[PDB]
Amino acid sequence: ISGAFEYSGWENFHRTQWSWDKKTRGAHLVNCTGACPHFVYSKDGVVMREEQSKDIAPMPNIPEYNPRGCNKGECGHDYMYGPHRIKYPLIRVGERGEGKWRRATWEEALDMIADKCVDTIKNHAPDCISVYSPVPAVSPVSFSAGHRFAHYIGAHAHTFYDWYGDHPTGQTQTCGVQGDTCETADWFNSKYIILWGSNPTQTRIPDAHFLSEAQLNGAKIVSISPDYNSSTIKVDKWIHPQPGTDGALAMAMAHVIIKEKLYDAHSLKEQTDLSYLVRSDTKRFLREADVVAGGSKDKFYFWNAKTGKPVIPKGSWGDQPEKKGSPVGFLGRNTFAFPKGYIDLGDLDPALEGKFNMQLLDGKTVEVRPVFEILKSRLMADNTPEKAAKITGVTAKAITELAREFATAKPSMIICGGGTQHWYYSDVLLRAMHLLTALTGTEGTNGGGMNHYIGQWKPAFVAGLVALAFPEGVNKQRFCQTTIWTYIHAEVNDEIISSDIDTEKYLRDSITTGQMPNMPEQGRDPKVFFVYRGNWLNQAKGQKYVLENLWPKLELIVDINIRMDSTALYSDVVLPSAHWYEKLDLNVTSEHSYINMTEPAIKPMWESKTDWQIFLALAKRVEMAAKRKKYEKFNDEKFKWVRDLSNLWNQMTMDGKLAEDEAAAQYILDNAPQSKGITIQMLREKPQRFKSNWTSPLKEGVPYTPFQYFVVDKKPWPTLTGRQQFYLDHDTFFDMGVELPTYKAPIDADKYPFRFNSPHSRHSVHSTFKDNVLMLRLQRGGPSIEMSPLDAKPLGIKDNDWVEAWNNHGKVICRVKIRNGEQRGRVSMWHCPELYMDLLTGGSQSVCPVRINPTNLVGNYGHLFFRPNYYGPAGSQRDVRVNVKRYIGATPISF
Amino acid sequence: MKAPRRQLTYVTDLNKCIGCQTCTVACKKLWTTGPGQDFMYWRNVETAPGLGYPRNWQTKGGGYKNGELQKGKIPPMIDYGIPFEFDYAGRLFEGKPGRVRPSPTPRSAPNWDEDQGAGEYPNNSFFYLPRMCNHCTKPACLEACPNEAIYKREQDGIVVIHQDKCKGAQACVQSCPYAKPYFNPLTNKANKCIGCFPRIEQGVAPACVAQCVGRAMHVGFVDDVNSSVYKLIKQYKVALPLHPEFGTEPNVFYVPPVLGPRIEMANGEPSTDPKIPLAQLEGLFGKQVRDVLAILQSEREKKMKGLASDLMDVLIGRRSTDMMISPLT
Numbered sequence A: 001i002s003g004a005f006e007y008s009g010w011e012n013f014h015r016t017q018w019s020w021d022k023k024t025r026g027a028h029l030v031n032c033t034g035a036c037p038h039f040v041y042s043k044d045g046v047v048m049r050e051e052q053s054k055d056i057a058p059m060p061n062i063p064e065y066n067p068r069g070c071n072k073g074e075c076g077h078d079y080m081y082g083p084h085r086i087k088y089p090l091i092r093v094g095e096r097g098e099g100k101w102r103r104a105t106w107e108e109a110l111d112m113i114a115d116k117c118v119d120t121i122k123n124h125a126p127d128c129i130s131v132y133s134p135v136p137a138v139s140p141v142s143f144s145a146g147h148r149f150a151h152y153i154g155a156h157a158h159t160f161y162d163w164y165g166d167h168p169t170g171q172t173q174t175c176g177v178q179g180d181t182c183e184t185a186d187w188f189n190s191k192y193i194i195l196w197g198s199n200p201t202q203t204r205i206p207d208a209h210f211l212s213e214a215q216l217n218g219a220k221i222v223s224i225s226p227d228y229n230s231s232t233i234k235v236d237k238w239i240h241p242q243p244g245t246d247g248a249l250a251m252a253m254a255h256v257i258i259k260e261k262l263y264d265a266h267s268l269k270e271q272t273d274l275s276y277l278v279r280s281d282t283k284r285f286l287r288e289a290d291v292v293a294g295g296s297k298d299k300f301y302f303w304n305a306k307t308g309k310p311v312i313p314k315g316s317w318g319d320q321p322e323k324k325g326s327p328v329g330f331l332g333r334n335t336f337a338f339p340k341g342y343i344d345l346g347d348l349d350p351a352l353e354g355k356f357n358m359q360l361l362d363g364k365t366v367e368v369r370p371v372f373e374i375l376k377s378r379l380m381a382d383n384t385p386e387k388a389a390k391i392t393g394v395t396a397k398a399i400t401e402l403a404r405e406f407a408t409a410k411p412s413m414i415i416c417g418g419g420t421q422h423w424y425y426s427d428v429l430l431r432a433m434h435l436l437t438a439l440t441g442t443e444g445t446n447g448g449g450m451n452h453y454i455g456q457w458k459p460a461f462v463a464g465l466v467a468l469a470f471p472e473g474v475n476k477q478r479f480c481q482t483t484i485w486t487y488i489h490a491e492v493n494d495e496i497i498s499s500d501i502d503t504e505k506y507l508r509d510s511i512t513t514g515q516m517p518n519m520p521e522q523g524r525d526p527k528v529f530f531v532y533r534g535n536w537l538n539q540a541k542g543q544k545y546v547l548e549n550l551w552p553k554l555e556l557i558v559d560i561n562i563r564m565d566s567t568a569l570y571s572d573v574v575l576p577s578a579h580w581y582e583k584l585d586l587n588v589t590s591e592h593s594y595i596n597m598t599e600p601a602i603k604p605m606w607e608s609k610t611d612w613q614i615f616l617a618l619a620k621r622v623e624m625a626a627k628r629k630k631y632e633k634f635n636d637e638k639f640k641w642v643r644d645l646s647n648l649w650n651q652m653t654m655d656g657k658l659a660e661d662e663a664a665a666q667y668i669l670d671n672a673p674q675s676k677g678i679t680i681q682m683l684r685e686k687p688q689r690f691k692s693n694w695t696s697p698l699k700e701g702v703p704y705t706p707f708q709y710f711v712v713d714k715k716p717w718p719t720l721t722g723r724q725q726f727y728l729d730h731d732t733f734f735d736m737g738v739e740l741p742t743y744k745a746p747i748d749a750d751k752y753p754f755r756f757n758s759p760h761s762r763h764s765v766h767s768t769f770k771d772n773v774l775m776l777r778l779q780r781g782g783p784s785i786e787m788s789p790l791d792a793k794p795l796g797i798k799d800n801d802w803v804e805a806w807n808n809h810g811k812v813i814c815r816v817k818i819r820n821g822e823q824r825g826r827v828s829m830w831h832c833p834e835l836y837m838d839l840l841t842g843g844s845q846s847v848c849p850v851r852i853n854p855t856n857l858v859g860n861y862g863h864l865f866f867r868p869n870y871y872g873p874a875g876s877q878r879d880v881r882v883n884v885k886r887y888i889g890a891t892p893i894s895f
Numbered sequence B: 001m002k003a004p005r006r007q008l009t010y011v012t013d014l015n016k017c018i019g020c021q022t023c024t025v026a027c028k029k030l031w032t033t034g035p036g037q038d039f040m041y042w043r044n045v046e047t048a049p050g051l052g053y054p055r056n057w058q059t060k061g062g063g064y065k066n067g068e069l070q071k072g073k074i075p076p077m078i079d080y081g082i083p084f085e086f087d088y089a090g091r092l093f094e095g096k097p098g099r100v101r102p103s104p105t106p107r108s109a110p111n112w113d114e115d116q117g118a119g120e121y122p123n124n125s126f127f128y129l130p131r132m133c134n135h136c137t138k139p140a141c142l143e144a145c146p147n148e149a150i151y152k153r154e155q156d157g158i159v160v161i162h163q164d165k166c167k168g169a170q171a172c173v174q175s176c177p178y179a180k181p182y183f184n185p186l187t188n189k190a191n192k193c194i195g196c197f198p199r200i201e202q203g204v205a206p207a208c209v210a211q212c213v214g215r216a217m218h219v220g221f222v223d224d225v226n227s228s229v230y231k232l233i234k235q236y237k238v239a240l241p242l243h244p245e246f247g248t249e250p251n252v253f254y255v256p257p258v259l260g261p262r263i264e265m266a267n268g269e270p271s272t273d274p275k276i277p278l279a280q281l282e283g284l285f286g287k288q289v290r291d292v293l294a295i296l297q298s299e300r301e302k303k304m305k306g307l308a309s310d311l312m313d314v315l316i317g318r319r320s321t322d323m324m325i326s327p328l329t
């Protein structure tokens, strides 16, 4: 006898359902910040399902990262077989957006694109061609293909970090870096976490367990959010301010902390600019130039209280190192070149309070005060709990208690996100959050610091990526700043009258002084637009301006995609890209310190090709086109570069070395310190941890936490002052009233009564998975907009009624969800459903303009200069207001 | 009957479930992608309070009353939700105008009232309730089947509807008070959760446990005194079956939520009461809920004072294999 039970044989039906003959490693190459390791299961050449591989190496004493994953991810293969797939190259035959196509061969498709690219260069300028492809960390090889293409032919690239509103503008202002953040495992080390405009139950799904686990291990957590969001059901305290008033909350906490002396004086003195001296007459930093013949305008003073004399602090912009290192993309300047110990306080005792007199070069005498003194005075006057209570609607008692708890628990940390980052004045608000961290001394400590989370912006091996995408150098590459590019070319109306904020003058002056780029040059129109790995039209702010003004300037729009998204639907040529499980690519994120990847489980389906292969194939047809059109080589005076189009393919592939996807992936690993040593084979078997990281040591068994090279190794902060700089004495900052952190009320230029909120949903990754049938079945079959019952009832609106939301920019009609946890006075629409989904007109971007805060255009003040994705205007959208009413063309009954 | 030699047992930590539906998706793409199964969610996750899936299932009837088998209702299809369907081809590829609307007109769906719950701002409250078949020690479904198509596995206590023995009598659908057997109108068979026995047989955790992203699921055999399920159920006694008064004696247990902010008073100040009403939890899990919460709050407070709490360590689950049969596959 078998030793088998009565019904065992029949049960073979179900065991057969869980079987496979091949198992391969997969990843989901979308902007979600998961970078979740996965296995892909195929049987008889068909992908059957995926499942978390759960094989990230644990660290001692803290929860493992495993399993990660999420609801989109476990149905990711739906986009292999679903009704959305691009199978063949498509050329448009009706009007843009109609979905009227004809199938073309690759030859005809790529030749059309090649003909147009050569003509455009020949007849106009190379910079009238552009490629948009965001978030290289998501899929560095695929990102590098279009970028390398553009790099050799002279097309310009775009920015994404700031365009999306995710670049932490205030942190760059404060710390002189592009950005950095702890990996989420470090949350487990904190005793006190403030979730500040962040909804990780829905927007950090694979990492959220660390939060509830921290709480069970004894941590306290605070949620700060206008609506009672999904995250908030598990926190210990919920604070609910008026939208965009968080600045007042934070400054009042600063006030309490300072007035009650709950702060780390030693830290303030060593690591910030709060001791640096300000002239009472010009309200600028006292500088060495003011006092000494031939003195630096980039060196400063503090008052040393143990010697009763002024002293020049070490490490500011004017202090040069030793040996000078190479520029490091995510730093204002390479302050790593300085020696360890360099800005150690030693036995210095910088004053934080008092007035002092000093004698100028010209002999006359000026009163000076330290920044902290000015800050303290202004806070005592303007940012009491009682005043902030009136503004935010948070009680004065609550604000005080939050303040004391934040400053007493150690470590404490702030976790901020879209809710606080996507506002016009988010730069000043993050400066304020960084002021709170600085005051409590927790920057650079495990479980501490100001930690921002948004999208998949950070690729730790960034030099290996720059090697593959921009091999002749970043300084020999055209970049626009996409927020500016959209604003100008879509001829946006921001509704901000010049006499309030002269956006036009700032923008124009920033460009003609070369602080910010403007592409194309000489006022030419953009003519050719490559879009892939981002749904740029669907997600674009000022969308109605874009469709009406920018889109028709474009002679050719090319979308390369796995699926027909809205951008592709509105394009001229659509090319079929291989699914994530039919391609090879790396996949990384800032949330965890490990290198993920995907590999082919089956050959690319239909006539689809991998992104690397597509731009390689294009390169040949462009060679051919260039020969036909007798335009093979041309001068490019901007870079003193004679380009040879007849050798584009060899340029693309480094004379054939990088013609396979895997060589391109390995080329990346080989060319960064964070990854050199790692092979594709290793990664194929198991996720590997990065060898090193950015602004801290990466230590065995310990979660990364940023900025330790400054906080611990006492290297200077890459700022003008060499510290965490809270005083920015540039003209544009005085103009806006933001030389110091302080409260800036939101833009009310939309003269409509509801604030328009557009947060991210658990049910999609941006536009991707919006149209997934299963995801839609776990909702109400289409896009949604949320209203408080207190606003819906007087308007005659019922749950699931159609509703109409509009302002001067546009209009959207969407079914409503009435939710008690929503705050009255605002509506929330889960961002950017696809245009073709269940909407009677428009989309979430129809009611959003593009707006540019002047402080984000400053490009001539130390660490504030333009570098793509380092600094630039944020595409904010949370200041938007709209009106709402019941749509009456269709009022179905319920049952 | 014949009691099983071992009993597969689940513990769901309502302190940790983030309602991401990952488990709902994983189960569907593994076992219910077949004909007639589009409306079936063997594993689902509902907002509490709410209608649940199917709508008002908690008053459908079934289970036992003083030992007497009950015959409840058979939910109509609209209480499950007609699975929405879409014509993407026409709009994206065929030049048809008009939005890709859902058919039918949306009126109901398994997760229709997500995050709505109960109470007026600023005391709105809800949490997530994952559900599955409870592989009951007293399975109502199994007794009700006039064809003896439903059996309880001797080796692991998993309850299974034998698809060849099943003739579509639907007594089981009437009698399960959890509404977890689903009548397949195409095949004329009942379908339900198979406790992932093929994975269990290979020493792999069920998919809704192994793939749980919030790290809220525990599985094991309750006879293993070193399992997290024995620890939560028998030792610390902080995990309760859902609706015990149904009399089926579930083998899926819940750790009730103790995490959560306080009721906000009219002056804006915190009360001592939680936003989640005790009365709501007692409704779900009966009169033990108060004492379980006191234990959970007491142990969490030790961790807050930097003291040791082994119960908290169990819920934390720093290693997955401390929570579950190995999830690796």
Ligand SMILES: Nc1nc2c(c(=O)[nH]1)N[C@@H](/C(S)=C(/S)[C@H](O)COP(=O)(O)OP(=O)(O)OC[C@H]1O[C@@H](n3cnc4c(=O)[nH]c(N)nc43)[C@H](O)[C@@H]1O)C=N2
Pocket: A029, A030, A031, A134, A139, A142, A164, A165, A166, A418, A422, A455, A532, A533, A534, A535, A536, A539, A540, A541, A560, A561, A562, A563, A565, A577, A579, A580, A611, A758, A759, A760, A765, A766, A767, A768, A831, A832, A844, A845, A848, A877
């Ligand atoms: N009011 C409001 N507005 C907002 C926001 C808000 O919060 N409120 N949020 C922002 C933010 S923060 C972001 S990150 C954008 O939504 C990101 O959109 P994105 O186009 O990159 O993702 P998406 O997923 O939509 O597009 C990904 C596209 O790339 C396809 N794809 C995915 N993988 C590949 C691939 O491997 N190769 C190729 N060639 N294509 C691939 C994908 O199908 C989709 O079309 C922006 N607007």
Ligand SMILES: Nc1nc2c(c(=O)[nH]1)N[C@H]1C(S)=C(S)[C@@H](COP(=O)(O)OP(=O)(O)OC[C@H]3O[C@@H](n4cnc5c(=O)[nH]c(N)nc54)[C@H](O)[C@@H]3O)O[C@H]1N2
Pocket: A031, A032, A033, A166, A196, A197, A198, A199, A200, A202, A203, A204, A205, A224, A225, A226, A227, A229, A242, A243, A244, A245, A246, A416, A417, A418, A419, A420, A453, A454, A455, A456, A757, A758, A759, A760, A761, A762, A763, A764, A765, A766, A828, A878
């Ligand atoms: N499942 C899923 N996860 C995602 C994404 C996705 O598309 N799907 N997108 C990823 C990316 S790229 C983004 S940028 C992030 C965004 O995700 P988050 O960083 O979490 O930010 P939001 O979703 O915009 O809103 C966060 C919360 O803050 C609230 N809040 C809104 N306005 C304000 C305010 O003025 N003040 C305060 N204190 N709170 C406010 C919102 O109502 C909301 O509850 O998520 C990433 N994670």
Ligand code: SF4
Pocket: A027, A028, A030, A032, A033, A034, A035, A036, A068, A069, A070, A071, A072, A073, A074, A206, A765
């Ligand atoms: S989609 Fe993003 S989050 Fe969801 S599983 Fe794939 S990678 Fe992880």
Ligand code: SF4
Pocket: B016, B017, B018, B019, B020, B021, B022, B023, B024, B045, B128, B130, B211, B212, B213, B214, B215, B216, B217
């Ligand atoms: S996966 Fe785990 S956490 Fe997400 S819903 Fe299912 S049970 Fe709750």
Ligand code: SF4
Pocket: B132, B133, B134, B135, B136, B138, B139, B140, B141, B142, B159, B175, B176, B177, B178, B179, B180, B181, B192, B248
């Ligand atoms: S839950 Fe319903 S179906 Fe599963 S065993 Fe108990 S009674 Fe039978």
Ligand code: SF4
Pocket: B026, B027, B028, B031, B042, B043, B132, B133, B193, B194, B195, B196, B197, B206, B207, B208, B209
């Ligand atoms: S145990 Fe297996 S079958 Fe039962 S619900 Fe969880 S996944 Fe679906």
Ligand code: F3S
Pocket: B144, B145, B146, B147, B148, B149, B150, B161, B165, B166, B167, B168, B169, B170, B171, B172, B173, B189, B190
């Ligand atoms: S009662 Fe029995 S016959 Fe099938 S429909 Fe239910 S298992």
Ligand SMILES: O=S([O-])[O-]
Pocket: A047, A048, A049, A077, A078, A081
């Ligand atoms: O695997 S299924 O989607 O054909």
Ligand SMILES: O=[Se]([O-])O
Pocket: A031, A135, A160, A161, A162, A164, A165, A166, A167, A454, A455, A456, A457
């Ligand atoms: O890459 Se982030 O701006 O989503």
Ligand SMILES: [Mo]
Pocket: A164, A166, A454, A455, A456
């Ligand atoms: Mo983002």
Ligand code: NA
Pocket: A123
């Ligand atoms: Na032309």
Ligand code: NA
Pocket: A078, A082, A083, A771, A772, A773, A774
């Ligand atoms: Na689908």
Ligand code: NA
Pocket: B087, B090, B091, B096, B097, B098, B099, B100
């Ligand atoms: Na249609």
Ligand SMILES: [Zn+2]
Pocket: A047, A048, A049, A077, A078, B029, B033
């Ligand atoms: Zn499938």
